[PDB]
Amino acid sequence: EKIKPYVRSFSKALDELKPEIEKLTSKSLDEQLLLLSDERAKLELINRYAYVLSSLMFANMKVLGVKDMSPILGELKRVKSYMDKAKQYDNRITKSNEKSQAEQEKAKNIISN
Amino acid sequence: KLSSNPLTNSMRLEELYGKYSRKHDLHEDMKQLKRKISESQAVIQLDDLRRRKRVLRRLGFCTPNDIIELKGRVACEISSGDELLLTELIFNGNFNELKPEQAAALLSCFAFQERCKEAPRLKPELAEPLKAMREIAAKIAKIMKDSKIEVVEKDYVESFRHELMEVVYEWCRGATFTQICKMTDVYEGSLIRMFKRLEELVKELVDVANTIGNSSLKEKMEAVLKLIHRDIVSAGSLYL
Amino acid sequence: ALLPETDRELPQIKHILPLLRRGIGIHHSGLLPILKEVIEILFQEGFLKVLFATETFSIGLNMPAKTVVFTSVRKWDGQQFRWVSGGEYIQMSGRAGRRGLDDRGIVIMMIDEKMEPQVAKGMVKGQADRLDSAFHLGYNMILNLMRVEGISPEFMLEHSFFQFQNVISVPVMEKKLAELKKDFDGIEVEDEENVKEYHEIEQAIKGYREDVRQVVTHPANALSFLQPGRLVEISVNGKDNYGWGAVVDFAKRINKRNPSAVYTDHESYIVNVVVNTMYIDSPVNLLK
Amino acid sequence: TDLFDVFEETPVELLADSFEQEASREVDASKGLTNSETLQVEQDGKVRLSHQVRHQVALPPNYDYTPIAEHKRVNEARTYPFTLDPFQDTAISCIDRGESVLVSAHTSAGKTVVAEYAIAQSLKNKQRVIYTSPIKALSNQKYRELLAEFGDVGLMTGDITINPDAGCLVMTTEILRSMLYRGSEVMREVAWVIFDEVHYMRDKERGVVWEETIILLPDKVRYVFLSATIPNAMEFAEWICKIHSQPCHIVYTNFRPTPLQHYLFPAHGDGIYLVVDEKSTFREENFQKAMASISGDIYKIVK
Amino acid sequence: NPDVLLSRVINVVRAASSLASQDVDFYKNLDRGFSKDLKSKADKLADMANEIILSIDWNNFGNIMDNLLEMSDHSLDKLNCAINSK
């Protein structure tokens, strides 16, 4: 009367997930990085698979319901950590384009000046 | 349910539960003693190996798939000192900005290990390549820290006793063996024994430069040899 | 004369000669490499009547004497100024006595401490030490082991003496493992399988009522009902059941000895209860 | 924002050849330092001294074994006019038969006699033999001790390498292990290697090498091991025989060649008392007198 | 696109918060059919994690996690040094 709704609502999540998995796990992880020459996009592709695997092993431990959730949780903070490095690097790159455009637009004003 | 359970205590079911319990207590200690065996025949030697194998994939010394590189082969050619750092110190080009007297002071930190007496603040053409090599060694200690290896940076860095730099630098400039022993309290044959270990590092640096095609290093190293292999270090024995 | 020119006037060479002219010798590694062997020559020529040596002349064979004299009961090995044990000392005893030259060997040790007899039985009459390998890992090893293709870095690990006692401990347990496999198979045959489905309910009785013991026991509760004389089931930590009791009083366990010890509100209040089931050999005189 | 707060947020909740062997000897009675005789004299004027010898072999799997106590050496690769004390006779017969062997004996017990049988044997097989000594000073010692014995002996060291093209080679473990990783051509002509000072594998720094080299050494070569009198030697024989699949004999003895006398000297005292005899029997009451003595001293001792 | 797919993963973890919401000892104590059903539902998670192992191909999970962030260590070392040398 209470768990009988959630079991459908839990299993419908994975059935909505598993054909996305078989497409995502279709090409091997070393193969798909070999398609992308972008090393910056490689850092997104690698950590995404670890974030998914950390998501379900935590959730399988939530299905197992062991009261000891400590070792599964700290590696998630590493998984939390290695996405933080990515964005701060990119903001340097994007604002580096903001810097070189600041001169070329200013210098060609001086050519008019 | 215990009321609606068939055989609640019927036909002495709790004694039969005791017959189930002692079966459970024997069958349950097996899987705890099997895992006492199953965790016994595990090789204890891969876990620190994989942390080391983590490191060798980092620095270009090998591939992620365990294939030896030239950097690994250069590390295979070095056995006198730190095969990690000397492979780093060569490939970073630190010996390019050195003289045959300058580099050997940087090599003196590697053929000598025992605790000795503190040198003063040294010459700026000596402390600077010492200042160059420490941050490289600080970088390696960072990755070994990253590989969860119990390494103190300072114990990684200041394991290298840099007090015999001034001896070898001047022994690379034609000095007397009498004069150079007065610059420390380290005993004389112990200084001879480390020069003859320092020969072995040149024997590597003669050979390591052959592996790459860096005779610019090697001819500079061969200048060090005659600045090493002379009056007292060149001697022979009496069993021979 | 075999040395070069300027080397023949080094002061360590100069001052070591007239001691040797007296037949007095010094042997340690801080001497020159040439000075190590030539003193061993004249010791093997016997013209050195006393040697003062470092500990590696233990290893130097083909040069024994008659008497080995110790001046030091203990030696700082870098980590401990320790009594020398037996198998250390027996190889330290292995130097005295020339074979066809001496009838006896004389071992003398200097001491200024009160040695207990089991120490002398443990040092002088001691046993040999265990050859147990100290295999570790090296970075130059790993790239060598990946280099030599037919062998692996795991291949050295297969035959390791560093893992040997954990290898030897397994045939001890496989004897015990084999027993219990048959010791189960006699009690494997259950006359009715429903006791297992009972067991999973019967342990659920001891499992799901186990939670309520952690729930009945709430720290700030069972309060405004602990007036004295009240009937109470007395079972400290669920393992020492003292039956039904009667409340005498309660009081706060205010710990002024170190206020940093903060009690849960079970522990912070101390209740006295009279129970009638305390065993006759219980130490009534020791509880506070 | 933060995606990782989904994990923080709340759920919406409602062995063979094992034996002990006897051997003995007799030694002249002497006072040493104590005022009377150290031990009881024989009626003949000696003092008789006995000692124990142990042997055991680690058997290979599927190996049909003939006991070496049943073996006879018809001809020696190396001559010895003296009396072969049968811990030496047992092991040279193993080297005569062609087997790996451990010798766990004292430094003066006679480990020199046994291992040198394997040297001329390869020379009587026209093969090359290798002696591994741990110390350079021992290497120069064992070169001089063996080159004067045969002459076809070479040296490789980190310091000085003379005659790599000799039939025998006094050299180190670290010469040898590196040549395994170098893949040296001398490793082709080897059927026999002597290991000196085998109990050095317990070193926290270098003891890795005496283990790592042996597993790198081939299953063909029968080995010679000179180790000290050690108690746990047979578990080592399991470690030898498993990894090479060739038989490994051990030779244990308690044999003490020169008879020793243990005296205790108090600092700034004179009473110098035998506390352990030649027969390893602790004098408890002389020791009591040694401690009851307690309420530059070298010059007292030497003169 | 990952913003499509990870948003599908977001719903799964939130529904994984929906399953580890309540206490299951009321219905699992009742029937093995309830007990086997989530035992049937847990068989997905053993099989779904095994698919990622084939992409790689409890103490095994530690051997998983260091290898995952490992070339992730390698990337940013190349990403900064592509700009540090620039």
PDB file of C-alpha atoms in Angstrom, chain B residues 55-225:
ATOM      1  CA  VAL B  55      52.883   6.877 -11.203  1.00  0.00           C
ATOM      2  CA  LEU B  56      54.743   5.433 -14.174  1.00  0.00           C
ATOM      3  CA  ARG B  57      51.733   6.162 -16.377  1.00  0.00           C
ATOM      4  CA  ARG B  58      51.749   9.794 -15.248  1.00  0.00           C
ATOM      5  CA  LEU B  59      55.189  11.057 -16.159  1.00  0.00           C
ATOM      6  CA  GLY B  60      55.487   9.510 -19.613  1.00  0.00           C
ATOM      7  CA  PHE B  61      57.763   6.787 -18.280  1.00  0.00           C
ATOM      8  CA  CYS B  62      55.320   4.201 -19.646  1.00  0.00           C
ATOM      9  CA  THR B  63      51.903   3.860 -21.258  1.00  0.00           C
ATOM     10  CA  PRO B  64      48.568   3.370 -19.484  1.00  0.00           C
ATOM     11  CA  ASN B  65      48.815  -0.154 -20.913  1.00  0.00           C
ATOM     12  CA  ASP B  66      52.141  -1.039 -19.328  1.00  0.00           C
ATOM     13  CA  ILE B  67      54.377  -0.657 -22.400  1.00  0.00           C
ATOM     14  CA  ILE B  68      57.857   0.581 -21.538  1.00  0.00           C
ATOM     15  CA  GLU B  69      58.861   3.929 -23.012  1.00  0.00           C
ATOM     16  CA  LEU B  70      62.312   5.305 -23.767  1.00  0.00           C
ATOM     17  CA  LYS B  71      61.778   7.258 -20.558  1.00  0.00           C
ATOM     18  CA  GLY B  72      61.282   3.904 -18.871  1.00  0.00           C
ATOM     19  CA  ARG B  73      64.372   2.515 -20.600  1.00  0.00           C
ATOM     20  CA  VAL B  74      66.331   5.555 -19.426  1.00  0.00           C
ATOM     21  CA  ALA B  75      64.963   4.734 -15.986  1.00  0.00           C
ATOM     22  CA  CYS B  76      66.087   1.165 -16.664  1.00  0.00           C
ATOM     23  CA  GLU B  77      69.581   2.503 -17.364  1.00  0.00           C
ATOM     24  CA  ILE B  78      69.789   4.382 -14.041  1.00  0.00           C
ATOM     25  CA  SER B  79      70.477   2.510 -10.807  1.00  0.00           C
ATOM     26  CA  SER B  80      72.941   4.774  -8.968  1.00  0.00           C
ATOM     27  CA  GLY B  81      70.308   7.149  -7.560  1.00  0.00           C
ATOM     28  CA  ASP B  82      66.713   8.216  -8.024  1.00  0.00           C
ATOM     29  CA  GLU B  83      65.581   6.617 -11.266  1.00  0.00           C
ATOM     30  CA  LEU B  84      62.512   8.835 -11.080  1.00  0.00           C
ATOM     31  CA  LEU B  85      64.222  12.179 -10.586  1.00  0.00           C
ATOM     32  CA  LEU B  86      67.310  11.607 -12.738  1.00  0.00           C
ATOM     33  CA  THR B  87      65.048  10.610 -15.612  1.00  0.00           C
ATOM     34  CA  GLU B  88      63.231  13.862 -14.894  1.00  0.00           C
ATOM     35  CA  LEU B  89      66.382  15.961 -14.476  1.00  0.00           C
ATOM     36  CA  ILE B  90      67.794  14.811 -17.808  1.00  0.00           C
ATOM     37  CA  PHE B  91      64.620  15.186 -19.846  1.00  0.00           C
ATOM     38  CA  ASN B  92      63.870  18.595 -18.400  1.00  0.00           C
ATOM     39  CA  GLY B  93      67.157  19.743 -19.929  1.00  0.00           C
ATOM     40  CA  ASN B  94      68.720  20.808 -16.643  1.00  0.00           C
ATOM     41  CA  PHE B  95      72.147  19.594 -17.786  1.00  0.00           C
ATOM     42  CA  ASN B  96      72.000  21.818 -20.867  1.00  0.00           C
ATOM     43  CA  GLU B  97      72.713  24.925 -18.780  1.00  0.00           C
ATOM     44  CA  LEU B  98      75.596  23.278 -16.918  1.00  0.00           C
ATOM     45  CA  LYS B  99      79.355  23.047 -17.143  1.00  0.00           C
ATOM     46  CA  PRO B 100      81.302  19.796 -16.529  1.00  0.00           C
ATOM     47  CA  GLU B 101      82.146  21.245 -13.123  1.00  0.00           C
ATOM     48  CA  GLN B 102      78.615  22.557 -12.529  1.00  0.00           C
ATOM     49  CA  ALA B 103      76.678  19.369 -13.238  1.00  0.00           C
ATOM     50  CA  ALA B 104      78.750  17.132 -10.974  1.00  0.00           C
ATOM     51  CA  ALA B 105      77.679  19.082  -7.909  1.00  0.00           C
ATOM     52  CA  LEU B 106      74.125  18.293  -8.983  1.00  0.00           C
ATOM     53  CA  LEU B 107      75.270  14.679  -9.348  1.00  0.00           C
ATOM     54  CA  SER B 108      76.988  14.733  -5.951  1.00  0.00           C
ATOM     55  CA  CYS B 109      73.597  14.728  -4.218  1.00  0.00           C
ATOM     56  CA  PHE B 110      72.828  11.274  -5.618  1.00  0.00           C
ATOM     57  CA  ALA B 111      75.909   9.145  -4.978  1.00  0.00           C
ATOM     58  CA  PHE B 112      75.831  10.025  -1.265  1.00  0.00           C
ATOM     59  CA  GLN B 113      73.056   9.253   1.186  1.00  0.00           C
ATOM     60  CA  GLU B 114      74.283   9.149   4.799  1.00  0.00           C
ATOM     61  CA  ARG B 115      73.550  12.046   7.167  1.00  0.00           C
ATOM     62  CA  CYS B 116      76.465  14.444   7.474  1.00  0.00           C
ATOM     63  CA  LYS B 117      77.270  17.985   8.534  1.00  0.00           C
ATOM     64  CA  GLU B 118      75.345  21.046   7.302  1.00  0.00           C
ATOM     65  CA  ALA B 119      76.887  23.118   4.542  1.00  0.00           C
ATOM     66  CA  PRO B 120      76.607  26.922   4.595  1.00  0.00           C
ATOM     67  CA  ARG B 121      74.751  29.000   2.057  1.00  0.00           C
ATOM     68  CA  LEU B 122      76.588  28.077  -1.096  1.00  0.00           C
ATOM     69  CA  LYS B 123      77.727  29.771  -4.276  1.00  0.00           C
ATOM     70  CA  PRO B 124      74.909  31.059  -6.516  1.00  0.00           C
ATOM     71  CA  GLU B 125      76.128  28.907  -9.409  1.00  0.00           C
ATOM     72  CA  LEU B 126      75.643  25.935  -7.076  1.00  0.00           C
ATOM     73  CA  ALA B 127      72.450  26.616  -5.110  1.00  0.00           C
ATOM     74  CA  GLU B 128      70.476  27.613  -8.210  1.00  0.00           C
ATOM     75  CA  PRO B 129      70.629  24.172  -9.921  1.00  0.00           C
ATOM     76  CA  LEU B 130      69.934  22.821  -6.474  1.00  0.00           C
ATOM     77  CA  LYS B 131      67.032  25.256  -6.453  1.00  0.00           C
ATOM     78  CA  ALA B 132      66.027  23.982  -9.890  1.00  0.00           C
ATOM     79  CA  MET B 133      65.998  20.299  -8.950  1.00  0.00           C
ATOM     80  CA  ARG B 134      63.973  20.597  -5.740  1.00  0.00           C
ATOM     81  CA  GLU B 135      60.789  21.891  -7.341  1.00  0.00           C
ATOM     82  CA  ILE B 136      60.992  19.078  -9.884  1.00  0.00           C
ATOM     83  CA  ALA B 137      61.354  16.687  -6.955  1.00  0.00           C
ATOM     84  CA  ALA B 138      58.514  18.550  -5.261  1.00  0.00           C
ATOM     85  CA  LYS B 139      56.389  17.813  -8.329  1.00  0.00           C
ATOM     86  CA  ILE B 140      57.125  14.087  -8.149  1.00  0.00           C
ATOM     87  CA  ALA B 141      56.289  14.017  -4.440  1.00  0.00           C
ATOM     88  CA  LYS B 142      52.987  15.645  -5.338  1.00  0.00           C
ATOM     89  CA  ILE B 143      52.023  12.761  -7.628  1.00  0.00           C
ATOM     90  CA  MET B 144      53.182  10.133  -5.133  1.00  0.00           C
ATOM     91  CA  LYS B 145      50.982  11.969  -2.646  1.00  0.00           C
ATOM     92  CA  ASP B 146      48.247  11.769  -5.289  1.00  0.00           C
ATOM     93  CA  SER B 147      48.887   8.033  -5.610  1.00  0.00           C
ATOM     94  CA  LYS B 148      48.095   7.704  -1.865  1.00  0.00           C
ATOM     95  CA  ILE B 149      51.692   6.741  -1.062  1.00  0.00           C
ATOM     96  CA  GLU B 150      52.748   7.781   2.437  1.00  0.00           C
ATOM     97  CA  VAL B 151      55.398  10.314   1.411  1.00  0.00           C
ATOM     98  CA  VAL B 152      56.477  13.426   3.301  1.00  0.00           C
ATOM     99  CA  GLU B 153      57.598  16.088   0.800  1.00  0.00           C
ATOM    100  CA  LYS B 154      60.533  17.220   2.918  1.00  0.00           C
ATOM    101  CA  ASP B 155      61.557  13.622   3.535  1.00  0.00           C
ATOM    102  CA  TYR B 156      61.254  13.097  -0.187  1.00  0.00           C
ATOM    103  CA  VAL B 157      63.096  16.328  -0.957  1.00  0.00           C
ATOM    104  CA  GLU B 158      65.737  16.645   1.762  1.00  0.00           C
ATOM    105  CA  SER B 159      66.726  12.987   1.598  1.00  0.00           C
ATOM    106  CA  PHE B 160      69.325  14.281  -0.864  1.00  0.00           C
ATOM    107  CA  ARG B 161      72.329  15.451   1.116  1.00  0.00           C
ATOM    108  CA  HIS B 162      73.577  18.467  -0.818  1.00  0.00           C
ATOM    109  CA  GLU B 163      76.681  19.173   1.250  1.00  0.00           C
ATOM    110  CA  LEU B 164      79.251  17.493  -1.027  1.00  0.00           C
ATOM    111  CA  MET B 165      78.443  19.782  -3.944  1.00  0.00           C
ATOM    112  CA  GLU B 166      81.308  22.131  -3.130  1.00  0.00           C
ATOM    113  CA  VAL B 167      83.753  19.231  -2.849  1.00  0.00           C
ATOM    114  CA  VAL B 168      83.039  17.664  -6.227  1.00  0.00           C
ATOM    115  CA  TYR B 169      82.818  21.066  -7.927  1.00  0.00           C
ATOM    116  CA  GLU B 170      86.363  21.853  -6.843  1.00  0.00           C
ATOM    117  CA  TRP B 171      87.517  18.286  -7.416  1.00  0.00           C
ATOM    118  CA  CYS B 172      86.248  18.977 -10.914  1.00  0.00           C
ATOM    119  CA  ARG B 173      88.705  21.893 -10.849  1.00  0.00           C
ATOM    120  CA  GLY B 174      91.959  20.069 -10.098  1.00  0.00           C
ATOM    121  CA  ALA B 175      92.004  20.225  -6.301  1.00  0.00           C
ATOM    122  CA  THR B 176      94.193  18.376  -3.811  1.00  0.00           C
ATOM    123  CA  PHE B 177      92.632  15.450  -1.979  1.00  0.00           C
ATOM    124  CA  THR B 178      94.130  16.925   1.189  1.00  0.00           C
ATOM    125  CA  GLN B 179      92.341  20.266   0.732  1.00  0.00           C
ATOM    126  CA  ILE B 180      88.873  18.934   0.021  1.00  0.00           C
ATOM    127  CA  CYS B 181      88.704  16.703   3.104  1.00  0.00           C
ATOM    128  CA  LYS B 182      89.007  19.773   5.343  1.00  0.00           C
ATOM    129  CA  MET B 183      85.672  21.105   4.095  1.00  0.00           C
ATOM    130  CA  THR B 184      83.644  18.576   6.107  1.00  0.00           C
ATOM    131  CA  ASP B 185      84.036  16.001   8.863  1.00  0.00           C
ATOM    132  CA  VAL B 186      82.938  13.131   6.593  1.00  0.00           C
ATOM    133  CA  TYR B 187      85.695  10.530   6.625  1.00  0.00           C
ATOM    134  CA  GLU B 188      88.131  10.303   3.757  1.00  0.00           C
ATOM    135  CA  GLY B 189      87.627   6.773   2.478  1.00  0.00           C
ATOM    136  CA  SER B 190      83.899   7.371   2.792  1.00  0.00           C
ATOM    137  CA  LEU B 191      84.482  10.305   0.446  1.00  0.00           C
ATOM    138  CA  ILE B 192      86.468   7.995  -1.811  1.00  0.00           C
ATOM    139  CA  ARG B 193      83.661   5.432  -1.708  1.00  0.00           C
ATOM    140  CA  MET B 194      81.108   7.992  -2.790  1.00  0.00           C
ATOM    141  CA  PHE B 195      83.320   9.274  -5.613  1.00  0.00           C
ATOM    142  CA  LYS B 196      83.546   5.696  -6.798  1.00  0.00           C
ATOM    143  CA  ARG B 197      79.787   5.570  -6.558  1.00  0.00           C
ATOM    144  CA  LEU B 198      79.831   8.915  -8.372  1.00  0.00           C
ATOM    145  CA  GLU B 199      81.874   7.260 -11.121  1.00  0.00           C
ATOM    146  CA  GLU B 200      79.029   4.753 -11.484  1.00  0.00           C
ATOM    147  CA  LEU B 201      76.570   7.584 -12.032  1.00  0.00           C
ATOM    148  CA  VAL B 202      78.846   8.916 -14.768  1.00  0.00           C
ATOM    149  CA  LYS B 203      79.000   5.322 -16.070  1.00  0.00           C
ATOM    150  CA  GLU B 204      75.244   5.657 -16.279  1.00  0.00           C
ATOM    151  CA  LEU B 205      75.458   9.155 -17.765  1.00  0.00           C
ATOM    152  CA  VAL B 206      77.922   7.873 -20.342  1.00  0.00           C
ATOM    153  CA  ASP B 207      75.398   5.124 -21.137  1.00  0.00           C
ATOM    154  CA  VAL B 208      72.087   7.017 -20.687  1.00  0.00           C
ATOM    155  CA  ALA B 209      73.096   9.667 -23.216  1.00  0.00           C
ATOM    156  CA  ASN B 210      73.844   6.878 -25.702  1.00  0.00           C
ATOM    157  CA  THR B 211      70.212   5.725 -25.558  1.00  0.00           C
ATOM    158  CA  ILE B 212      68.910   9.080 -26.843  1.00  0.00           C
ATOM    159  CA  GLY B 213      71.615  10.577 -29.044  1.00  0.00           C
ATOM    160  CA  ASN B 214      72.592  13.280 -26.555  1.00  0.00           C
ATOM    161  CA  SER B 215      76.367  13.311 -26.951  1.00  0.00           C
ATOM    162  CA  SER B 216      76.121  16.992 -26.001  1.00  0.00           C
ATOM    163  CA  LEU B 217      75.446  15.578 -22.555  1.00  0.00           C
ATOM    164  CA  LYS B 218      77.905  12.706 -22.924  1.00  0.00           C
ATOM    165  CA  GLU B 219      80.932  14.682 -24.132  1.00  0.00           C
ATOM    166  CA  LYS B 220      80.194  17.076 -21.296  1.00  0.00           C
ATOM    167  CA  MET B 221      80.003  13.994 -19.058  1.00  0.00           C
ATOM    168  CA  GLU B 222      83.272  12.678 -20.480  1.00  0.00           C
ATOM    169  CA  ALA B 223      84.873  15.939 -19.436  1.00  0.00           C
ATOM    170  CA  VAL B 224      83.675  15.120 -15.902  1.00  0.00           C
ATOM    171  CA  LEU B 225      85.394  11.710 -16.040  1.00  0.00           C
TER     172      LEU B 225
END
